[PDB]
Design an enzyme around this catalytic site. Structure first.
Site, mmCIF file in Angstrom:
data_model
loop_
_atom_site.group_PDB
_atom_site.id
_atom_site.type_symbol
_atom_site.label_atom_id
_atom_site.label_comp_id
_atom_site.label_asym_id
_atom_site.label_seq_id
_atom_site.Cartn_x
_atom_site.Cartn_y
_atom_site.Cartn_z
ATOM 1 N N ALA A 50 8.255 -25.395 72.476
ATOM 2 C CA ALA A 50 8.409 -24.463 71.452
ATOM 3 C C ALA A 50 9.643 -25.020 70.851
ATOM 4 O O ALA A 50 10.401 -25.729 71.276
ATOM 5 C CB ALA A 50 7.906 -23.198 71.696
ATOM 6 N N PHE A 51 9.686 -23.892 69.417
ATOM 7 C CA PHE A 51 11.048 -24.652 68.790
ATOM 8 C C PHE A 51 11.978 -23.351 69.299
ATOM 9 O O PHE A 51 13.268 -23.725 69.027
ATOM 10 C CB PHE A 51 10.691 -24.180 67.382
ATOM 11 C CG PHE A 51 10.379 -22.490 66.968
ATOM 12 C CD1 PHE A 51 11.349 -21.695 66.629
ATOM 13 C CD2 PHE A 51 9.161 -22.183 66.908
ATOM 14 C CE1 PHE A 51 11.118 -20.569 66.274
ATOM 15 C CE2 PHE A 51 8.784 -20.771 66.739
ATOM 16 C CZ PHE A 51 9.951 -20.075 66.322
ATOM 17 N N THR A 71 -2.370 -33.016 70.868
ATOM 18 C CA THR A 71 -3.828 -33.047 71.343
ATOM 19 C C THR A 71 -3.956 -34.313 72.122
ATOM 20 O O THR A 71 -5.158 -34.350 73.017
ATOM 21 C CB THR A 71 -4.579 -33.049 70.076
ATOM 22 O OG1 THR A 71 -4.354 -31.975 69.096
ATOM 23 C CG2 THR A 71 -5.967 -33.269 70.348
ATOM 24 N N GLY A 98 4.279 -22.755 74.239
ATOM 25 C CA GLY A 98 4.028 -22.256 72.830
ATOM 26 C C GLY A 98 3.223 -21.158 72.599
ATOM 27 O O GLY A 98 3.120 -20.067 73.408
ATOM 28 N N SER A 99 2.426 -21.111 71.214
ATOM 29 C CA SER A 99 1.675 -19.932 70.916
ATOM 30 C C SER A 99 0.354 -19.830 71.865
ATOM 31 O O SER A 99 -0.043 -20.838 72.284
ATOM 32 C CB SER A 99 1.291 -19.857 69.530
ATOM 33 O OG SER A 99 0.580 -20.957 69.352
ATOM 34 N N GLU A 102 2.316 -21.600 79.459
ATOM 35 C CA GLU A 102 3.418 -20.397 78.977
ATOM 36 C C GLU A 102 3.191 -20.141 77.587
ATOM 37 O O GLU A 102 3.829 -20.747 76.810
ATOM 38 C CB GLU A 102 4.847 -21.053 79.108
ATOM 39 C CG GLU A 102 5.268 -21.534 80.850
ATOM 40 C CD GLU A 102 5.759 -20.166 81.975
ATOM 41 O OE1 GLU A 102 5.821 -19.167 81.072
ATOM 42 O OE2 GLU A 102 6.011 -20.565 82.964
ATOM 43 N N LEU A 103 2.620 -19.002 77.313
ATOM 44 C CA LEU A 103 2.210 -18.776 76.003
ATOM 45 C C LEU A 103 2.770 -17.376 75.510
ATOM 46 O O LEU A 103 3.945 -17.105 75.653
ATOM 47 C CB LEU A 103 0.615 -18.698 76.249
ATOM 48 C CG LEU A 103 -0.014 -19.621 76.694
ATOM 49 C CD1 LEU A 103 -1.502 -19.312 76.581
ATOM 50 C CD2 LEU A 103 0.164 -20.976 76.153
ATOM 51 N N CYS A 119 10.234 -15.415 73.594
ATOM 52 C CA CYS A 119 8.990 -14.929 73.909
ATOM 53 C C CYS A 119 9.196 -13.863 74.697
ATOM 54 O O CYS A 119 8.297 -13.121 74.920
ATOM 55 C CB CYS A 119 8.578 -16.332 74.731
ATOM 56 S SG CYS A 119 9.482 -16.509 76.277
ATOM 57 N N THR A 120 10.116 -13.421 75.237
ATOM 58 C CA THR A 120 10.320 -11.995 75.998
ATOM 59 C C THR A 120 10.914 -11.261 75.193
ATOM 60 O O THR A 120 11.433 -10.074 75.522
ATOM 61 C CB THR A 120 11.333 -12.435 77.068
ATOM 62 O OG1 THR A 120 12.513 -13.103 76.853
ATOM 63 C CG2 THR A 120 10.745 -13.363 78.292
ATOM 64 N N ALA A 172 15.592 -12.415 83.082
ATOM 65 C CA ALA A 172 15.028 -13.395 83.945
ATOM 66 C C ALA A 172 16.081 -14.415 84.325
ATOM 67 O O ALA A 172 16.911 -14.727 83.653
ATOM 68 C CB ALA A 172 13.837 -14.182 83.185
#
Ligand SMILES: *C(=O)c1ccc(N(CC)CC)cc1
Lengths: 509, 509, 508, 509
Positions: free
Chosen positions: D163-164, D229, D244-245, D266-267, D300-301, D460
């Site tokens: 991710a970014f 993809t 990512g998302s 890991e979303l 993300c957390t 974490a």
């Protein structure tokens, strides 16, 4: 007249016991040693007799056990677990009569007698699964074309010496684990629980015999100090698991160390319960009572020291005394009885000796402290206040129902007072403070092998490694990775490549 | 006059070494015991002096170390690992001069001097990750509303006594593991490698001090047998890691057991290489050579017994004879040298004595056996044939380059001969047979802590636990779960429920 | 008429089986769905009938199971192990009648039917100890006054879809591990082994009932593709353990992945045996034989591809011929019989289709290849030579006793040929070369989940984690740390200090 | 003009970044795809350009990484660890300029930029030790003469999509573990952090090349959804680590499952903080603030939901608003600034839309909620009360500093409310109740992969396995035994005996 000759004790014959029993087993039954009579501690009446092992008996037995090991060690660990499973079932089939014998010869109440046998059955069911799990890691070698593995093999012969207070389960937990680990066993129980040792050995013997296995895999050599010392000095005894007092354990440990053998020492206890101000008194009082008077204070994990905060000290003591008055006393085989007799007449004397010493050192007996005027070895559960925490008798393990109560103020000093003794088996604090609980488990907390929270000093189970620190010996039994003590580790490097070493300027071939 | 006062040895100053050096560190540098001069074994010339610890210095150091533990033990293990990481880097920055010192004072060739320091570097990097991993399992309690956890805490003060032959890495491997485990270390190295001990301590001290930590976390008390005995009898020393001879280790072990302390014993060895008929001889001859003459036969894992099958016996010997004649002898710091001097003049006396007893017991010297007429303590690498496998001198660890060769016919007897000695450190077979290789690793195989296949007895690395069995002591260092030896286990039951124990007919509240 | 109505099969009554049986259990017994009749592959006769699950049955069962979980997850794991111990004993008491039912409704020989039950008995005993061991490590936190712990909790409801060939033990290994881990179970067996499912369920039900536990803890909803599909789409099924064909498993995996559920897939196999020039032929021939014809070639681990070094190829094949002709055929419950019938009539046709398609691809039948003219689904054990290793029919799992034999020269290529297929369950080499053996176990070796040396492809046991790679699913059962697949991991940091966060310039 | 041409940003050249950079690295540097320009989110100005991967670039790269794997997989795991160690070192040397690049291209404040690089450094040190430890157990076989071992081998090519918001460390923790496990890596970072991906690649590339290793071991192919993809469909990608998302992650997961590949997902997250009545408010208020506004709420957390007990609801909310006002917003590359800009312009739009959708849902903005009038993508940290806990926008992960506040009354319901969403990454409660804390960790507690007590949702570290459940993907990275996800398990039975199978009435030979 021996009890086993009386019709009311005919149930003893269900364990294969007779008027005179053989105290040596190694595939065959024998015993040319001293003939001992064991007694029921509830009435001081003789139960039956056991012919112990002579030196020659011990010699022949050790040789037969080590020859049997050649067979047993070649049997796959999961199949050794199958033998242990069968031992478990065999104990189940005799759980009531065997539990009755424990109550009769040792003197604990019946539910604890049966319960002790259940503990053995339970460790068997545990060892069955563990027998498919024991082993070490495959490591990645830094060398190309090489393998790095950790192998575990049996040590060989595991000598097992056990105490009187748990004449079944202590041996049982050494037995079940040592067997799946591919070891043969040699048992010398406490002389005063000889019938129990014979009874258990008979049960195991049949299992081995039915599976066409040499009975010397679980050998028995009944006896006292002489047989035990022989085991401690015997180079053929690869591991010596000693369970008993610190005084005897110290000498056994020194003898084993002298010959570079392995020892597993499970020694004395002087376990403390600490009750902070925020504690649950509805939890503290019954927890302290049962941990102190349980088995008439003859557990290694018996609560013998009680530290209470100044604020709640008087209240907790008063509530203890009102509850001590309700303790029901009588025959250990009586289901309404909570509290039985001490194991020996000498135990009664030690009890009085400690009480007198406590008083001389400024202590006060707020309950009990007197011998009960009745047949057997009965004494009153005792509570003593006033002693300095560093009193000599308080620092001494007296294997009797005597609880020394102390006052304290802060967490720092009361932790030090728990640790200030030489023993280091069990410990407990009662509190709701989250920070204190973790400090108790941390490097500045208890120095004991068993560190409990809101559960008294008797709180332990199969899944965890059982043992203590310092003068308690440092050995571990049962769960976790305690099996490793019954095996020897080898670090193995396997070069499977065709690579040759660097010549370093040397012309080979 | 001292070597350190000469221009060609000015590099010694880069290790902070002076004419006379303080031999005690506990945050402060001192020493008021006996002054010792260490000598270069290559030329028997004095290098520099170290003022060793007096008994009073030892007492002071232990006090400061235990006080430093109060701070060190509160530091999170990963942060202790960060300290060990910096120790590693500090060693990296000094690896050539320290490596040279090891070659100068101890006498191993330069590549092994540097290599030993590299080993300390490697164990440091390994310990960094391990610092985030050490701990015990959470187990499922059998009791509702209860948690069963296995806690691991530092034992406290770890005394480390090391040998002369690896005066850096042995302490180093003990140090890295003990520190991440939360312990403080007190180091007493071999007197004849005192400068090396002071140099290592200076390196570590700077790291501790740059991090504003008390230097007594890694204390140093240079001294001889008296300082060692003091450590062995000191109750304040929770763990004593001893690395040395069996004769000394036996007494150390006993003194520690006497006070119910913990010992870690890494003792003598009498390691055997066994070559079977199907062995690749182009692998055997070089492997045997380097394992026998490496470090002038002064490794604990040195090959001292060589069992060769009857069919290939004479061929392997002749090829070893021609190979031995190409071993390059010279000063340790000379480029491309393979063989240096023995550590002491007394070590040369032992060499000659063993040789004399060997031919007196029926042995034949087919190569070497004599002293070299050269400055320093140089002896010839030696091969002895004809000796019975059970000869007395063969069952003895003579810490000199002497290789005893034997014949064998079958696999069963040759496995027994490997196991018949009192030592149990390292062992190796060379063979291609699948079944034999697994029997060798199995319960009927080698009894040693190190069991190798197609790689000589010196084959060992960080990833695995290092140590031996029987008279080798039983201790383990470095890899696997050897870290548990530097920590104490506690089995903890936590009652987080609001449940109360059964009343059993007693009215509470 | 039904077999259960005839006197010689009166032993079926010992298992609680009747003419028509309830196929749903959730504490109560029911079944308002379609009635299926299962048949005996040895004589193609009907045994008895089972009322399968309706949609409403499924719904109320799932709901009751998740209700029972509230009670079951609060029970300490060692106590859950005690229940699994009692299940083990209950199986011992019925081991012979249950083994006979497996031989009757499924078709394997009696010793293997009994053997499969014993496998369930053993996994129970194993789970008993394991119930006291499941958990994670206490880790050293980098934060002062903090605890770092790895916790493991039950996932909740575990759906268990199973195949026909092992109608008892596959469910058993899932059931025993899932239960000690604190989960409740919903079982949908193979339709053609419905009676076996009902019988096993009755045994477990009594233990749960004798111990005053909600029966839904081990729930059963007999049904076919529709029930299985429902479980795969049901979000209330936290873990779906699927054991079956690759074709079906692929669709199951996608449905579960669609709803972000957990799946454990144990799928097809195309297991190869490789015999090098240095191999013990006295070991290779009987190993290849029994691995290939065992259970009429209806194991997931059955040897189907046999690679032989060109120097020993002809000798091995000839010795296999002579051995194959001694294989004793008959009723699976009859003594000395090594070889029973295929499970279904459809399997027989698929057997013939693979035989013809192997001929068309250039193969040669050196033994067998025909249907046996007798009552039941009996086909001859078959050996096919001449096919190229990359032949399509060889790459395909044909659940029938067909053995494809190839020749090879070097070690490098034959390792690639074992790995070149889509399946990846079991693999075996027979050799004595120390180096080759470790290479076989290494990164350039077999890509399978089971990698054996000097023991055929059916060599497995409880202590190890059982499963395959690639198109085999990737799931694991039984041993090692396979229990983690039935639980969820949580990493927990516990601040027990009184320390506050850094204010970072802000006043609180 | 580009920011890399203004001499104020001359330091960008220290990472070897030019005007237009190659985005493809296998053995060589290439890029025939579209040329993307990335912008500094703080001033919406172009920094530099990166030539992304064409289809031909991807096919070449993949093929080259699988050839390199043949070499890399033969290298012993500990030696692979040495490479990772050198990677950690190289990062240390460029930590300031690389950290500054993170702040420039991504937008987080400088300490978090440098800190993210430090995270990669630390996991590298962790990996070094782990590389000596990875492997499975040796188990006791039930079969005589049989060995039962569990083996672990690399999966092969590990594809990594990141991710970014953490354009260094997320890849870093994947890279460090995958490499020591013997896998090669193919990296496709977020298109908007392309410069960072190229910079990180160049650092690793120098390490590999200096060790004479094929650079394809850590390959790079910059691109958007098209390259990602292709990786998800490619059978040559044995493992796809997607970070990512949830929206994108779902489709990625489905494709990999379609081809029976392995995926590590890991979303998204929707992490909650629960504060009970007995909570220390001096701890809660700053904990919630830093967790919600940290990295401009783009972790993300990040804490997005805040459940406060009704008795303390109004106080805590006020205290937050009082502290929220003190938050110092400004340039990320500037001291004392706590909050930076959102990553994109599209992120600002999603921010406002969520604010509007929460007002229409009945919620009230009590602080912030508007865009900041200044260059760059800056928004106000927002607090929303009065919303229903099951509001649609509440269950939605909006990647912006938006904190929804809910009131609760009892423990059971508020636990359910934490689990009622699709996300299950992180969760936190603040309380002192012993029993509640264990229930929170128990089977009836949180359903998230991270279950914290008295620490925010951003808590974490390296030691534990990082990941979540449900719609978060299920994958685990970093600590514990997460390394097993980068390898494949095999259960190996070895018959080393001379025993033959039972003939079962068949005549052989
Ligand atoms: C394949 O046919 C197969 C796979 C697994 C099993 N098990 C393990 C669950 C039962 C023994 C049987 C058959």
């Amino acid at each position: 007249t021996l009890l086993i000759n009386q019709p009311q004790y005919a149930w003893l014959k269900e364990l294969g016991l007779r008027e005179e029993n053989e105290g040596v087993y190694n595939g065959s039954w024998g015993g040319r040693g001293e003939v001992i009579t064991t007694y029921c501690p509830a009435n001081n009446e003789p139960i039956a007799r056991v012919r112990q092992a002579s030196v020659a008996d011990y010699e022949e037995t050790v040789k037969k056990a080590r020859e049997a090991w050649k067979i047993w060690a070649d049997i796959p660990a999961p199949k050794r677990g199958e033998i242990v499973r069968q031992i478990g079932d065999a104990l189940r089939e005799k759980i009531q009569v065997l539990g009755s014998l424990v109550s009769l010869e040792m003197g604990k109440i019946l539910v604890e007698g049966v319960g002790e046998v259940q503990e053995y059955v339970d460790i068997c069911d545990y060892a069955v699964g563990l027998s498919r799990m024991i082993g070490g890691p495959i490591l990645p070698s830094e060398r190309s074309g090489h393998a790095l593995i950790e192998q575990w093999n049996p040590v060989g012969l595991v000598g097992i010496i056990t105490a009187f207070n748990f004449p079944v389960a202590v041996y049982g937990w050494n037995n079940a684990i040592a067997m799946i680990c591919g070891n043969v066993c040699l048992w010398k129980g406490a002389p005063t629980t000889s019938l129990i040792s014979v009874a258990v050995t008979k049960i195991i013997a049949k299992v081995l015999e039915d599976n066409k296995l040499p009975g010397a895999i679980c050998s028995l050599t009944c006896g006292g100090a002489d047989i035990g010392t022989a085991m401690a000095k015997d180079e053929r005894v690869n591991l010596l698991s000693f369970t008993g007092s610190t005084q005897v354990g110290k000498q056994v440990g020194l003898m084993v160390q002298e010959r570079f053998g392995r020892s597993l020492l499970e020694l004395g206890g002087n376990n403390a319960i600490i009750a902070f101000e925020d504690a649950d008194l509805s939890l503290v009082v019954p927890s302290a009572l049962f941990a102190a008077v349980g088995t008439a204070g003859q557990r290694c994990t018996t609560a013998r020291r009680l530290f209470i905060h100044e604020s709640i000290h008087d209240e907790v003591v008063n509530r203890l005394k009102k509850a001590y008055a309700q303790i029901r006393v009588g025959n250990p085989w009586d289901p309404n009885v909570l509290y039985g007799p001490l194991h020996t007449k000498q135990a009664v004397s030690m009890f009085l000796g400690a009480v007198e010493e406590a008083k001389k050192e400024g202590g006060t007996v707020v309950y009990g402290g007197k011998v009960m005027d009745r047949p057997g070895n009965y004494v009153e559960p005792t509570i003593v206040t006033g002693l300095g925490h560093d009193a000599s008798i308080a620092h001494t393990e007296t294997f009797a129902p005597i609880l020394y109560v102390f006052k304290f103020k802060n967490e720092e000093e009361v932790f030090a007072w728990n640790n200030e003794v030489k023993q280091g088996l069990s410990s407990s604090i009662f509190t709701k403070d989250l920070g204190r609980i973790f400090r108790w488990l941390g490097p500045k907390g208890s120095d004991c092998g068993i560190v409990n929270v809101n559960i008294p000093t008797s709180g332990a189970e199969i899944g965890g490694a059982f043992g203590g620190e310092k003068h308690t010996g440092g050995g571990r039994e049962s769960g976790s990775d305690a099996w490793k003590q019954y095996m020897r580790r080898s670090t193995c490097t396997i070069n499977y490549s065709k690579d040759l070493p660097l010549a370093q300027g040397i012309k080979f071939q």
